[PDB]
Amino acid sequence: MGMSRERSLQQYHQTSDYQSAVRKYIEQAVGRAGRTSLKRKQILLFVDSGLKEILAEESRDPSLFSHEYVALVNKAKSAGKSIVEDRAVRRL
Amino acid sequence: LTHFNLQEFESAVYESFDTRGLRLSSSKSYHHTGLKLVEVAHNQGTRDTVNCKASFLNTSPSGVLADMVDAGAVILGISATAR
Amino acid sequence: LYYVTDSVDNVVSAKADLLKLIEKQTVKGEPRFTLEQQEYLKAQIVHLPNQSEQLLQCSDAVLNDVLIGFNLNAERDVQAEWSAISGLRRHASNPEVKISLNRQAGYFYRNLIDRLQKKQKGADRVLLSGSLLASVETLLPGEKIRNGSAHVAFLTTSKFLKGFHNTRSRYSPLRDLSGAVLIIDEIDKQNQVILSELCKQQAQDLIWAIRTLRANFRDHQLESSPRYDKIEDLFEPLRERLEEFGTNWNLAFAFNTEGANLNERPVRLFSDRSFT
Amino acid sequence: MNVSIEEFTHFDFQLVPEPSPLDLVITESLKNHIEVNGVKSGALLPLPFQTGIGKTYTALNFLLQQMLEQVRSELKEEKKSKRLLYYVTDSVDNVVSAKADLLKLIEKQTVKGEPRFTLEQQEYLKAQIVHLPNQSEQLLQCSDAVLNDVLIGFNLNAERDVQAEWSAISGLRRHASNPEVKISLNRQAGYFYRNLIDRLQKKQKGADRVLLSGSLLASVETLLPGEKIRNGSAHVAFLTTSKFLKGFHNTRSRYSPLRDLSGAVLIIDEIDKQNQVILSELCKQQAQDLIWAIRTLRANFRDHQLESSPRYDKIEDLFEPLRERLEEFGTNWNLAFAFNTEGANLNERPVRLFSDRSFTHVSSATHKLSLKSDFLRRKNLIFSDEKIEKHGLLTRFVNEADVIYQWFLGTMRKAVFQYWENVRGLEIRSLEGTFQEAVQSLLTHFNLQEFESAVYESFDTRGLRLSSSKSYHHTGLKLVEVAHNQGTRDTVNCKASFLNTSPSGVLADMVDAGAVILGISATARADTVIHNFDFKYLNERLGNKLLSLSREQKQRVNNYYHSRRNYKDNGVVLTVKYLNSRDAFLDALLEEYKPEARSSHFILNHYLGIAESEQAFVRSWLSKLLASIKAFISSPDNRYMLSLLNRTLDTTRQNINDFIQFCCDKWAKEFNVKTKTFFGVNADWMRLVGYDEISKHLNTELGKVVVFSTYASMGAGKNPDYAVNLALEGESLISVADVTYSTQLRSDIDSIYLEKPTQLLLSDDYSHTANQLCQFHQILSLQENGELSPKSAENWCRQQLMGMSRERSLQQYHQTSDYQSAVRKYIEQAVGRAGRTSLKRKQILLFVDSGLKEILAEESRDPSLFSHEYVALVNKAKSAGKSIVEDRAVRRLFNLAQRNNKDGMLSIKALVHRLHNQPASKSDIQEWQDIRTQLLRYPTVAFQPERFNRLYLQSMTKGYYRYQGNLDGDPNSFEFFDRVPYGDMVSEEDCSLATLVQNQYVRPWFERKGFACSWQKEANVMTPIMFTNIYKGALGEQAVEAVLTAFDFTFEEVPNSIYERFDNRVIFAGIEQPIWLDSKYWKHEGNESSEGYSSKIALVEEEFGPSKFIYVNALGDTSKPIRYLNSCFVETSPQLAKVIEIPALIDDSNADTNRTAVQELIKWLHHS
DNA sequence: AACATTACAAAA
DNA sequence: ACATTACAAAAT
């Protein structure tokens, strides 16, 4: 019918694919900023609070995550756990 | 194409062999069937005939990658968010 | 061997770093490769940019050599375009000139390579050796791949999907991927790059196409030479299907619409081809 | 705000300036055309107005008068469309200058001393004139504001593809450096204009059509000058010939003037040159693959149908015969298979075939090429039979395919016209408004969209169209190349290039479409078909539509020219000299140039850079040129010399220049006169410092000037005059007119040297195919006019197809009188373009290459309109007495007799072959019967025929002639008239018509049928082929039919299965078995075999069983016995014979019927 | 009443 | 063995 981009985005935001894409963008952003070996005493990360509920849903193996991404995920998860629908069951 | 007098399909055929010359059959998946969008509208310059202009996607990017792997190519994809 | 990534800058930088690695690699403290071995290794690596940048990086001497060696120096339509582009080149002002220079470079490269391929396909095929071979390999990096001088190619994803020219035709890597090795940098973005390439295909008029196929497959036949052995049997079911379909839908008539609301807006149909 | 038409209300349209005799010459001639013919008929008026007499002023005054007539009609008719006016010439510079002079004429015209037009009237008049340049120059003259307004108003400002291109071009515009940038800028302007106008037209065609008004309308009219013509704001257009032929764009489509020429007026400057210009476009057409085209037409016309709506009424019947022909052709040639070649020599070289489409066919193959369908291989193979099989030839297949393709294009034109008629009927809008929609609808109903372009160009060159008239000028030629397809080595294609008409045919089409054409040129009626239109063909085709000046009008023009160029009464003398080559003279200056050298040949070979082979040629060119220059330097009063050569003296021959320069200096020192030289004065030089330097030097320095140029460099609008400074010139100047020191004081060239023009055959550098078509067109035009015999033309065509050199083509051309006419045309133009002013020297020196003396001495036209210099040249040449030359008229008569005989010879054979092909057609029977009827009714005609022109030849005698040739052999070996004093004679007596008509039975039949009983003593008489193969047979058949009908016999029409095998079928007394008849006019040996007669009889009985066969001789001795023969033509008993032979029906001594023979025939019929 | 943008590659 | 050149327009 020819709807608008805002309505397509609203349709997309109801999927867990959207959250995975958000976390992918955050991971790339924090990874493209640690390219050297000389580090300051303190590294400050400031995050839009709307990302917190998303980043608390990271569940993959952190064996290959960067240090900044692990710090972000731990800080988000520090607020406890939130009730979410399992991706596998809904996909089933 | 010259034996069949079908030279006007030449370009089309070439493009097909670009996107489907890379090709376990009755498996069903959007990634190797694609989609089709058809517009039925009046022909240019004449107001009493119509045409059916169709745009196709015969495969998805994942289908293209699977085709390259199945064609014998060894692919090393390097990315931190590769999976 | 292919090194593929999305950006041109990453391709150029990766080739530069490979050359640096060849130059400066050491084992146990001694240099790994001698100067001759380094030169031989560097000779096997080729870079395939878009056609405009391919033309603009060739000197006027190389292009004059190519034109003289293929007897295109007297065509007028070719010499006028090349003279105009050389004049633009010697007057490279602010990018206002550069955009036009790039566009004309692309068009001239298309025309020149088309004529060169046509000349090489015929019986009066030019023999390539020495300075002419060097000039052609400078103008056509794919000729190095075709001859066997080089086997490593640095290119972008879109260039890989479209292919590159040599003296004979346009070579498509996708049709010759048996045994090749691909190193794809930033692989997850190649999904979007490939999708953008796939969504650019030309639309087809289905009524015209089916009518043409039905009209031409009704009578026309292949020759029964050994080159066409068992090829005619591949098309018989298609001929039967076409004849039955044309009988069913009355393809002798042309198509039209009538009624309300069918004129203001064209009809749009979407199909996933299975159940949507 | 723009002026309106309501301003001319108080203007008086009867007050005109005093008209010059040239204006009367135009208007008086054009009025009698409206009287004799109608107001809707076109005309062609060639006006021999020489340059400098005021021809541009006259043409522009006529154009302004037409503009005023249009304004007056609009005021009185207070909505008819405006009458279009076109000013067409070859050069862009001439177009721009003519428009500038028209605007100046509007601004500065006065009547009785008061200004003719007010400021607002002047603005309104200037608003009606438009100029149409090429698309690149059209774009580059629009400001960025206009283009931004156009893009914004059509919502193209956000498209990326358009905006990137426009940004690139705008960036290029500001950085306009040396032409290295300008060439690319022009190319990009052309491409961007293509894309932008295409998008604008697409957007205007759809429902979302932008409304144009105010600033957007002004911007669009600035970008698209044709939109002004389409709206009706303007109706006068200045454009070039090529632009006129191609057309121009408006907001809807590309407008083609050729399709809308009804009522338009064309002013064509330098008309005779346009013959060449038009040919160029005609030679640029795209080649067509005939195999692909015919296969596509056959596949798509087999099933696809048009809709039966009222818009398509009676259009399908236009295409039904083409469908039947296509299906029959496809079965005949097995178009289900693809084509290929095999054999020796068929691979190294492609096959080339040339056809004039009537009687000139040439093949590049040494042996006849055959075409065979191999069903086992499923292929169509082209063979070379190393051993006549009429069926199965490549030439037959190619000719039939070409015929079918052209038939399809013509039927598409007819269908477009019918669609326009139906649409006009329904929606009650010109032929141009429905042309594209009709083409699209027809091609999409038939699924034949790939022919779209092929249709459009055709309607350009054949939509401009007294039918059975035969002439090369409206049939054209065809060049076919059979060669392997690209990329595949087992199929071939047949690429064909066509010329469907000649430039003369195009001009005749424009005149017949309702256009009034004024062609202005001093050499407008030259006697060349190579460098001018064919005016014999134009006269034949147009009749009184081709206007001309009477003797009194010509004398008025001559008096006006003499009054403005009075030489004799003002003491101006023209001294003409003819220069021969002098070897010792050149040797002297050669030795003085390099005194250290041993011989002059060493100097030419080493110092001048002349190769030893060409030295002699140079020694003829140089020794003449210098001989003029010296004679110019020793002349005291002369200042300005122009040397017209064939080759440019640029830096490529720099060394030669030095030698000439040296000589000049020496001669200057020998005569104490300063001399300046201008070498290499060509078109590129004029684009640089632009001939104003020579004028300034003549105006400011007291020395002689010698300019070295060529014929090609001196164009129509070059104007080589300088501003006179009376201090530098003495008393040598003379005024030859009566004008009171009009504006500036200017003089012209005073001394001239003329070389013999050389490369007088046209050529095309666009491509190899275009040049081939140009050469073939020239050969065929020379054959059509009669300058070549058919044998010479066929040999020349064969050599051209083999690929000869230009020198051999020139040698072929030099043997014609067309060559001499072209030479004299070039000389006349050269001397006419050098007398453009009225201030003349005491003496005017003309130096002429002596090789021209023999040519110019053959001038024979009326010198009433020649210039003074040309008359002086002709008189000087003729001063050597008269030379014996062959008359052009009689030689053309011989050549045309041979041409007509050959054309009839081949046409009769083709028609008979088509007749002996069962099933036959109906147009073929009609053609055969019409030919016989025309010959019977008009054996000789007084006027030149129009519908059957190739059945007759023009003889020197009246009603009879002599010939000597083999009527069954080679048509190229026939001789006619006094060349064969003792030969076969064609007249009324050799056909024994007078003795035949004396009989009491044939004569009433001839009167009631209208057949001539005698031959009028006329100049047009039938060719020998028609006298022997057609006329005598018709006489015998008619005599036999009348004699038998007098005895109560009935005759019925033979059916097509046995046509031309037997003339008639006989019914008498109701005998239920069929009876077949054969008649021979007089006694002749039965060259057809008895086995052939038996074959015919068996063929007849195969379809009709037993019957009767009669072989009767119309005229002969009636005492001979009546014969009975069997099926084997052996004499047998009357009780079992099947063939009855009658030796004579009417006796040849007293014209008495053999009634006994008729009675015996009746008894024979009673015995069966 | 949702959501809220930049960037690029091959050109024909 | 002939004969013996330059110039134009519309561009696709």
CSV table of C-alpha atoms in Angstrom, one decimal, chain D residues 755-1001:
chain,number,residue,atom,x,y,z
D,755,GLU,CA,43.2,26.0,-60.9
D,756,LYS,CA,41.3,23.1,-62.4
D,757,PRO,CA,39.1,21.5,-59.7
D,758,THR,CA,40.0,17.9,-59.1
D,759,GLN,CA,38.2,15.7,-56.6
D,760,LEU,CA,34.7,16.1,-58.2
D,761,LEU,CA,33.2,12.9,-57.0
D,762,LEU,CA,31.4,13.1,-53.7
D,763,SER,CA,32.5,10.9,-50.7
D,764,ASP,CA,31.3,10.3,-47.2
D,765,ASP,CA,33.7,10.0,-44.3
D,766,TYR,CA,31.0,9.0,-41.7
D,767,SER,CA,31.6,5.3,-42.2
D,768,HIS,CA,32.6,2.7,-44.8
D,769,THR,CA,29.0,1.8,-45.5
D,770,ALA,CA,28.0,5.4,-46.0
D,771,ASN,CA,30.8,5.9,-48.5
D,772,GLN,CA,29.8,2.8,-50.4
D,773,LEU,CA,26.2,4.0,-50.6
D,774,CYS,CA,27.3,7.4,-51.8
D,775,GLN,CA,29.5,5.9,-54.6
D,776,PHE,CA,26.7,3.5,-55.7
D,777,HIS,CA,24.2,6.4,-55.7
D,778,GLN,CA,26.5,8.4,-57.9
D,779,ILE,CA,26.9,5.6,-60.4
D,780,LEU,CA,23.1,4.9,-60.4
D,781,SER,CA,22.3,8.6,-60.9
D,782,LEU,CA,24.7,8.9,-63.8
D,783,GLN,CA,23.0,5.8,-65.3
D,784,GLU,CA,19.5,7.2,-64.7
D,785,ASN,CA,20.3,10.5,-66.4
D,786,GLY,CA,21.8,8.8,-69.5
D,787,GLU,CA,25.5,9.9,-68.9
D,788,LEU,CA,26.4,6.2,-68.7
D,789,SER,CA,25.4,3.2,-70.8
D,790,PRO,CA,24.1,0.2,-68.8
D,791,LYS,CA,27.2,-1.8,-69.6
D,792,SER,CA,29.6,1.0,-68.4
D,793,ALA,CA,27.5,1.5,-65.3
D,794,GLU,CA,27.3,-2.2,-64.5
D,795,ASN,CA,31.1,-2.6,-64.9
D,796,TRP,CA,31.6,0.5,-62.7
D,797,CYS,CA,29.3,-0.9,-60.0
D,798,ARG,CA,31.1,-4.3,-60.2
D,799,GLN,CA,34.5,-2.6,-59.7
D,800,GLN,CA,33.0,-0.5,-56.8
D,801,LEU,CA,31.7,-3.7,-55.1
D,802,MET,CA,35.2,-5.3,-55.6
D,803,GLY,CA,36.6,-2.2,-53.8
D,804,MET,CA,38.6,-0.2,-56.2
D,805,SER,CA,40.5,3.0,-55.5
D,806,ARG,CA,39.4,6.6,-55.7
D,807,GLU,CA,41.6,7.4,-58.7
D,808,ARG,CA,39.9,4.7,-60.8
D,809,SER,CA,36.5,6.1,-59.8
D,810,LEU,CA,37.6,9.6,-60.8
D,811,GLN,CA,38.9,8.2,-64.1
D,812,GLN,CA,35.4,6.6,-64.7
D,813,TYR,CA,33.8,9.9,-63.9
D,814,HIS,CA,36.0,12.0,-66.1
D,815,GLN,CA,34.5,10.3,-69.2
D,816,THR,CA,31.1,11.9,-68.7
D,817,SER,CA,29.8,15.3,-69.6
D,818,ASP,CA,28.5,15.6,-66.1
D,819,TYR,CA,32.1,16.1,-65.1
D,820,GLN,CA,32.5,19.1,-67.4
D,821,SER,CA,29.3,20.6,-66.2
D,822,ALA,CA,30.6,20.2,-62.6
D,823,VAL,CA,33.9,21.8,-63.5
D,824,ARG,CA,32.1,24.8,-65.1
D,825,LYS,CA,29.8,25.1,-62.1
D,826,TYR,CA,32.8,25.3,-59.7
D,827,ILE,CA,34.4,27.9,-62.0
D,828,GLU,CA,31.2,30.0,-62.1
D,829,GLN,CA,30.8,29.9,-58.3
D,830,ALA,CA,34.5,30.8,-57.8
D,831,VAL,CA,34.3,33.9,-60.1
D,832,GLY,CA,30.9,34.9,-58.7
D,833,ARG,CA,32.0,34.9,-55.1
D,834,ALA,CA,34.7,37.4,-55.9
D,835,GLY,CA,32.7,40.4,-57.3
D,836,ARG,CA,30.6,41.3,-54.2
D,837,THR,CA,31.3,45.0,-54.3
D,838,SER,CA,30.7,47.9,-56.7
D,839,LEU,CA,34.2,49.6,-56.6
D,840,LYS,CA,36.3,48.1,-59.4
D,841,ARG,CA,39.9,48.5,-60.4
D,842,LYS,CA,41.0,49.8,-63.9
D,843,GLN,CA,41.9,46.2,-64.8
D,844,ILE,CA,40.7,42.9,-63.5
D,845,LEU,CA,43.2,40.1,-64.1
D,846,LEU,CA,42.0,36.5,-64.5
D,847,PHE,CA,44.6,33.8,-64.8
D,848,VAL,CA,43.3,30.4,-65.6
D,849,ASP,CA,44.8,26.9,-65.7
D,850,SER,CA,45.1,26.1,-69.4
D,851,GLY,CA,43.5,22.7,-68.8
D,852,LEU,CA,40.2,24.6,-68.3
D,853,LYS,CA,40.3,26.2,-71.8
D,854,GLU,CA,39.0,23.1,-73.5
D,855,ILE,CA,36.2,22.8,-70.9
D,856,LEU,CA,35.0,26.4,-70.7
D,857,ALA,CA,35.0,26.5,-74.6
D,858,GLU,CA,32.0,24.0,-74.4
D,859,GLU,CA,29.7,26.3,-72.6
D,860,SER,CA,26.5,26.5,-74.6
D,861,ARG,CA,23.8,27.8,-72.2
D,862,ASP,CA,22.1,31.3,-72.5
D,863,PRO,CA,24.6,33.9,-71.2
D,864,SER,CA,21.7,36.2,-70.3
D,865,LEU,CA,22.4,35.5,-66.5
D,866,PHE,CA,26.1,34.8,-66.5
D,867,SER,CA,28.4,37.2,-64.5
D,868,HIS,CA,30.8,39.4,-66.4
D,869,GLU,CA,33.9,37.4,-65.3
D,870,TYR,CA,32.4,34.1,-66.5
D,871,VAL,CA,31.4,35.6,-69.8
D,872,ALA,CA,34.9,37.0,-70.2
D,873,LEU,CA,36.4,33.5,-69.5
D,874,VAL,CA,34.0,31.8,-71.9
D,875,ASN,CA,34.7,34.3,-74.7
D,876,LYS,CA,38.5,34.0,-74.1
D,877,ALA,CA,38.2,30.2,-74.3
D,878,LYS,CA,36.1,30.3,-77.4
D,879,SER,CA,38.5,32.7,-79.1
D,880,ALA,CA,40.5,29.7,-80.2
D,881,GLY,CA,37.7,28.7,-82.6
D,882,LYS,CA,35.5,25.7,-82.2
D,883,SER,CA,36.5,22.1,-81.4
D,884,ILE,CA,34.8,18.9,-82.5
D,885,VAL,CA,32.9,17.4,-79.6
D,886,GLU,CA,30.1,14.8,-79.3
D,887,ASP,CA,26.6,16.1,-78.8
D,888,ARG,CA,25.3,15.4,-75.3
D,889,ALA,CA,21.7,14.9,-76.4
D,890,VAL,CA,22.3,12.2,-79.0
D,891,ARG,CA,24.7,10.3,-76.8
D,892,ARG,CA,22.2,10.4,-73.9
D,893,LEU,CA,19.6,9.2,-76.4
D,894,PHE,CA,21.7,6.1,-77.3
D,895,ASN,CA,22.4,5.4,-73.6
D,896,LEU,CA,18.7,5.8,-72.6
D,897,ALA,CA,17.6,3.6,-75.4
D,898,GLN,CA,19.9,0.9,-74.2
D,899,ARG,CA,18.8,1.4,-70.6
D,900,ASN,CA,15.1,1.2,-71.4
D,901,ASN,CA,15.6,-1.9,-73.5
D,902,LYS,CA,17.6,-3.6,-70.7
D,903,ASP,CA,15.0,-2.7,-68.1
D,904,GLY,CA,12.2,-4.1,-70.2
D,905,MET,CA,14.2,-7.2,-71.1
D,906,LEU,CA,14.7,-8.1,-67.4
D,907,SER,CA,11.2,-7.1,-66.3
D,908,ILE,CA,9.6,-9.3,-69.0
D,909,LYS,CA,11.7,-12.2,-67.9
D,910,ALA,CA,10.9,-11.8,-64.2
D,911,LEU,CA,7.2,-11.4,-65.0
D,912,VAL,CA,7.2,-14.5,-67.2
D,913,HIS,CA,9.0,-16.5,-64.5
D,914,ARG,CA,6.4,-15.4,-61.9
D,915,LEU,CA,3.7,-16.4,-64.4
D,916,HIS,CA,5.1,-19.9,-64.9
D,917,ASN,CA,4.8,-20.6,-61.2
D,918,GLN,CA,1.6,-22.3,-60.2
D,919,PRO,CA,-0.4,-21.0,-58.4
D,920,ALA,CA,-0.1,-17.6,-60.1
D,921,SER,CA,-1.1,-14.2,-58.7
D,922,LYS,CA,-3.8,-11.7,-59.8
D,923,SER,CA,-1.7,-8.6,-59.9
D,924,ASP,CA,0.7,-10.4,-62.3
D,925,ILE,CA,-2.2,-11.3,-64.7
D,926,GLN,CA,-3.3,-7.6,-64.4
D,927,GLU,CA,0.2,-6.4,-65.2
D,928,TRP,CA,0.6,-8.7,-68.2
D,929,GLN,CA,-2.8,-7.7,-69.6
D,930,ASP,CA,-2.2,-4.0,-69.0
D,931,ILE,CA,1.2,-4.2,-70.8
D,932,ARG,CA,-0.4,-5.9,-73.8
D,933,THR,CA,-3.3,-3.5,-73.8
D,934,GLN,CA,-1.1,-0.4,-73.6
D,935,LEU,CA,1.1,-1.6,-76.4
D,936,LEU,CA,-2.0,-2.5,-78.5
D,937,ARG,CA,-3.6,0.9,-77.9
D,938,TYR,CA,-0.5,3.1,-78.1
D,939,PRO,CA,2.3,1.5,-80.2
D,940,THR,CA,3.8,5.0,-80.4
D,941,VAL,CA,3.1,8.1,-78.3
D,942,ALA,CA,3.8,11.8,-78.9
D,943,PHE,CA,4.4,13.0,-75.4
D,944,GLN,CA,6.8,11.4,-72.9
D,945,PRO,CA,4.9,8.6,-71.2
D,946,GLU,CA,4.4,8.7,-67.4
D,947,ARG,CA,2.8,5.3,-66.5
D,948,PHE,CA,4.6,3.1,-69.0
D,949,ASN,CA,7.8,5.1,-69.6
D,950,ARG,CA,10.0,2.0,-69.7
D,951,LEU,CA,8.0,0.4,-72.5
D,952,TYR,CA,9.2,3.1,-74.9
D,953,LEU,CA,12.4,4.7,-76.2
D,954,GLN,CA,12.9,8.1,-77.8
D,955,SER,CA,14.1,7.7,-81.3
D,956,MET,CA,15.8,10.1,-83.7
D,957,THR,CA,13.3,9.2,-86.4
D,958,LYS,CA,9.4,9.2,-86.2
D,959,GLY,CA,7.6,5.9,-85.8
D,960,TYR,CA,10.5,3.6,-86.6
D,961,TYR,CA,14.1,2.8,-85.8
D,962,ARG,CA,16.8,0.2,-86.3
D,963,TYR,CA,18.6,-2.0,-83.8
D,964,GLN,CA,21.0,-4.9,-83.7
D,965,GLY,CA,21.0,-7.2,-80.7
D,966,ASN,CA,20.2,-10.7,-79.5
D,967,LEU,CA,16.8,-10.6,-77.8
D,968,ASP,CA,17.5,-13.8,-75.9
D,969,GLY,CA,21.2,-13.0,-75.1
D,970,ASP,CA,22.9,-10.1,-73.4
D,971,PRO,CA,21.0,-6.8,-73.0
D,972,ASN,CA,24.3,-4.9,-72.7
D,973,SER,CA,25.2,-5.5,-76.3
D,974,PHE,CA,22.3,-3.8,-78.1
D,975,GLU,CA,23.0,-1.0,-80.6
D,976,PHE,CA,20.5,1.5,-81.9
D,977,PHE,CA,19.8,4.1,-84.6
D,978,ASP,CA,22.6,5.2,-87.0
D,979,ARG,CA,25.1,3.0,-85.2
D,980,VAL,CA,23.4,0.1,-87.0
D,981,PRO,CA,22.3,1.2,-90.5
D,982,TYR,CA,21.6,-2.4,-91.5
D,983,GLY,CA,19.8,-4.2,-88.7
D,984,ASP,CA,16.5,-5.4,-87.4
D,985,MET,CA,14.0,-2.7,-88.0
D,986,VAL,CA,11.0,-1.8,-85.7
D,987,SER,CA,8.1,0.0,-87.4
D,988,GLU,CA,4.5,-0.6,-88.5
D,989,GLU,CA,5.5,-2.5,-91.7
D,990,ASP,CA,7.6,-5.1,-90.0
D,991,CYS,CA,4.7,-6.1,-87.8
D,992,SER,CA,2.4,-6.5,-90.9
D,993,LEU,CA,-0.4,-4.5,-89.1
D,994,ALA,CA,-1.6,-2.7,-92.2
D,995,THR,CA,-2.2,-5.9,-94.2
D,996,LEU,CA,-3.8,-7.6,-91.1
D,997,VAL,CA,-6.3,-4.8,-90.5
D,998,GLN,CA,-7.5,-4.9,-94.1
D,999,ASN,CA,-9.5,-8.1,-93.3
D,1000,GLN,CA,-13.2,-7.5,-92.8
D,1001,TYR,CA,-13.4,-9.3,-89.4
